Amino acid sequence: LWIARINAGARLNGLSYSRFINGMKKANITIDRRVLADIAMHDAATFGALVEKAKAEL
Amino acid sequence: MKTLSAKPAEVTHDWFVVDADGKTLGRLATQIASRLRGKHKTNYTPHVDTGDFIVVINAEKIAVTGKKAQDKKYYRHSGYPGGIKETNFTKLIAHKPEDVLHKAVKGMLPKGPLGYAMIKKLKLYAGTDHPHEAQQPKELDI
Amino acid sequence: RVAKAPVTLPNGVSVTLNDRQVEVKGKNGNLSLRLHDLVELKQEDDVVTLSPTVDSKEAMMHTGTIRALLNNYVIGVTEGFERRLQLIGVGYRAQATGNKVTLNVGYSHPVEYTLPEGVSAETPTQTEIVLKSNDKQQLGQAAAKIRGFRPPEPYKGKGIRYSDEHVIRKEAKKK
Amino acid sequence: AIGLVGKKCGMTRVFTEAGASIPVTVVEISANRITQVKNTDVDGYQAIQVTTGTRRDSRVTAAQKGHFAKAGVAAGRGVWEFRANDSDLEGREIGGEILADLFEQGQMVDVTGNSKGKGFQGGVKRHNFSMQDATHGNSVSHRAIGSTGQNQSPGKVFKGKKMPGQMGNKRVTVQGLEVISVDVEKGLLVIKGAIPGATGGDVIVRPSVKA
Amino acid sequence: MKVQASVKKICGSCKVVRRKGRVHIICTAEPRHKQRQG
RNA sequence: GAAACAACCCAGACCGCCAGCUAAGGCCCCAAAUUCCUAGUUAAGUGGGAAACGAGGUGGGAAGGCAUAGACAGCUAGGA
RNA sequence: UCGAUGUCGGCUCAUCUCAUCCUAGGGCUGAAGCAGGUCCUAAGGGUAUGGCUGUUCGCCAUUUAAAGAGGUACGCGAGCUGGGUUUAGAACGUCGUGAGACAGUUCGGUCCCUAUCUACCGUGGGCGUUGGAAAUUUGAGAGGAUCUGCUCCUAGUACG
RNA sequence: AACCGCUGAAAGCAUCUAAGCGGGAAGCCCACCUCAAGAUUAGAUUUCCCUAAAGAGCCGUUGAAGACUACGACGUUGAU
């Protein structure tokens, strides 16, 4: 459920889940998929800023 | 902190138009199936329909590749002994144009009460016009 | 070889390409062919040199048929084509009245055949049909369709046959 | 393609001068009042709606009473509709008249009616099942169905299996029947054939579709 | 014609022609040389 | 995981967690994850049952024979 | 599967396959015609009655356009039958000293079940179908049906 | 479908095929007959009615309708 929610959130603004997790891993971001799916589903501004940090890292 | 569901009363379904003129049958059906399920939404929960209403025009102008127009077979059994029937993609598109795309999408959805509910939101028409201007569906190239 | 050979345009004829649709006009009439989407047609001084878009075996194979078909249209509008049919039989006879040719070969009923639009038939004698048309395709189908009512027999030669057509002959009552 | 509704009056014979007996049936043809004309614009298809016979007012509903009043015709015992085409909707206006004049002597017509009902019937009468031995040790299965299927494969009875059930009392059409004589002053229609149903039953007569 | 799993030209007036993905033999000399792979 | 499938592949369940990494297998939809990138092949839905044998499918690789002293095919003449 | 899955044949009722028996369309033919022979396509229909034998089969008689090959628990006994096989009686031949035995024969010899579920054939009740009602209807679809002889004429012509 | 083509290149020819245009079976899809909107996508048209209406049902007389039903006719303004 979290992965599907994260996949929808990343695809709304930019990249896919597979490139999102790689971006978070390269940026040393430890946020779990549970918290990420809650940010995506409940605060889209933060997830937009969170995708950018992953997008600039690749 | 908990992972919450979509609360059907709080979900809204958006209206879109897809012009299926010259697009590949299966390449488009996957896109429609995902939208009907609401996979593109961050509040997607597999037990709530969070999808969208998709209006498809030019359903007869949808295309298949290779030699599939003359060779894709649609079988059905009537329920009587020896009651097996078959028709072509091109013979079915000439007799029931919406049934070709409706049948690809139906097999790409879950098979159950929620699956029956989210195919009810696929309003597909043969021709360039649809009777849904009241819903003001936005154009969507998918 | 066929594709690279240019099509020479006589004085009367003229070819115009309007939206992937070759139109060949001249003295006999007007013929048209659909240009394949893998072939380009360029014109020079009273000659048509058509070449493939990309250098590929499939494009060189479709420009060979457009060259051949268009060359037939050029000659077919310059002086036209002509096919001759012969009737062999005790009572085999044909009569052409306008666009409809009637022929009584061997049936319990005369058969009536209406020529395709673009082919004309005249019968000088009663056992020899002469067909004339602009395009070789429609002339050939008209002759093949008349000849298919009663194709030649291999035991006596009876039946409608092409002029200068080798008809195989078999011997009845052999041992 | 339009016809008319009649009532079966019984069968008789018509003798020809050459000395042949023609098995005929008499069809009473009351006035067929046109109660509605359906067209491609209002209904999506072209048809003529007619009524015939009579009903007392106490037995006619208010909804039907207004349907007839718009046409301007008297309430008939029923309402029947005939599928038509543009040529058939020529002199057919609302409240018009359809007599036995629609048919001429020597014309093939199609007659439809409700067959006599035989009620529940067994396989022997309903489907021409062969009876089983009346003697030779046969137990209590003389008019039985026999086998109804195969063994474990397929392990069921196939759909459409011939079995006992209701026989007759169904819509049945007989084609290729000649019109022997037409008389319109007395509402007559003499037809060569059998005409499914009993005396008094409603029958529909249409021009033959085989042609 | 002969419709067999082995089709080959016999006399020398026979052609190997393929139409609709299927191998034929046509002979202008002998009509019983006509073959089709199947 | 192999559709379902004691014996095949990965892997040995103390219990709990709405944490993370991986194995076999996978990433268009059912169904989690690439409609990912690069260079090609296939046109048979081959892929997604089956051989001897047949064929002028198509791609590639080592060599060859002939050729503007006119090569291959066609046509004309001869073929005694 | 032995705390039981009834054997062969017949009857009744079937359902499917195609490796097609008839009818349909074709190529080749040592195809003149008429008739065929092969092979391709084709499963829509149709595809006998008897004598003998328990027989399936097979032989035979007479037909038919034809009398197809098969699967279906060698389809079908909670649908029927019970002739054979395969209980207990009896006998013959044969084997055994014998009790007995014989894919040897012969005469005789109890076939239960009121159908719950699935399936099927019919026929209803309920609710729904964006207020209710009386009628008429469109048709997504489903089923049924689909066979064939002979005579005349063309014409005793084509062919021979 | 098999089969037979027309024009036509790949492959100067040939070639039913690759582009394009035809013929062609009791077979397929319609056409005929019956059923059919529980086609939950539950369709359409014509009328009628809404402070218990329009109607439907019960009941009764019943029917070439029928196991019970259902369906059809009639109930005093009436031939059930």
Nearest to B41 among A8, A37, A47 (CB): A8
Say what the resolution is, in angstroms: 2.7
**Least Cα separation, residue D160 to chain B (angstroms):** 7
A5, A31, A43: which to substitute to probe chain B, counting the most B Cβ within 10 Å?
A5
Phi, psi of D175 (to 5 degrees): -105, 165
Nearest to B39 among A8, A34, A42 (CB): A8
Residue tagged 């008499």 (tokens): D26
Q: How many CA atoms lie within 13 A of D36 on its CB side?
A: 19
Q: Does A12 touch chain B (CB under 8 A)?
A: yes
Q: Does A3 touch chain B (CB under 8 A)?
A: no
Q: Answer whether the bond into residue C116 is a cis peptide, omega within 30°.
A: no
Residues listed for chain B: 142
Q: Are strands E35-37 and E2-4 parallel, antiparallel or unpaired?
A: parallel
Strand F within 7 A of E22 CB: no
Using the structure, give the distance in angstroms from the CA atom of D156 to the C1' atom of H61, rounded to a whole number: 48
Using the structure, give the distance in angstroms from the CA atom of D150 to the C1' atom of G118, rounded to a whole number: 15
Cα B42 from Cα A39, distance rounded (Å): 9
Is B68 in a helix, a strand, or coil? Answer: helix
Please list, in sequence order, all residues whose beta carbon lies within 8 angstroms of the beta carbon of residue B31, skipping any fewer than 6 positions away.
Answer: B18, B142
Assess contact for D120 and D202: CB atoms under 8 A. no
**Least Cα separation, residue D45 to chain B (angstroms):** 19
Closest nucleotide to D36 by C1' from CA: H46
Amino acid at D2: I
Cα A24 from Cα C137, distance rounded (Å): 69
- Which nucleotides in chain F lie less than 7 Å from some protein C-beta? 18-21, 27-35, 43-45, 51-59
Method used for this model? cryo-EM
Cα B91 from Cα B114, distance rounded (Å): 31
The CA R_g of chain A, rounded to the nearest whole Å, is: 10
**Cα-based distances in Å from E38 to E3, E17, E21, E35:** 5, 14, 11, 9
What secondary structure letter does DSSP report for D116?
P
Q: Does B47 touch chain A (CB under 8 A)?
A: no
**In chain C, which residues from 116 to 155 place their CB closer than 7 Å to nucleic acid strand G?**
154-155
Assess contact for C26 and C12: CB atoms under 8 A. yes
Amino acid at C142: A
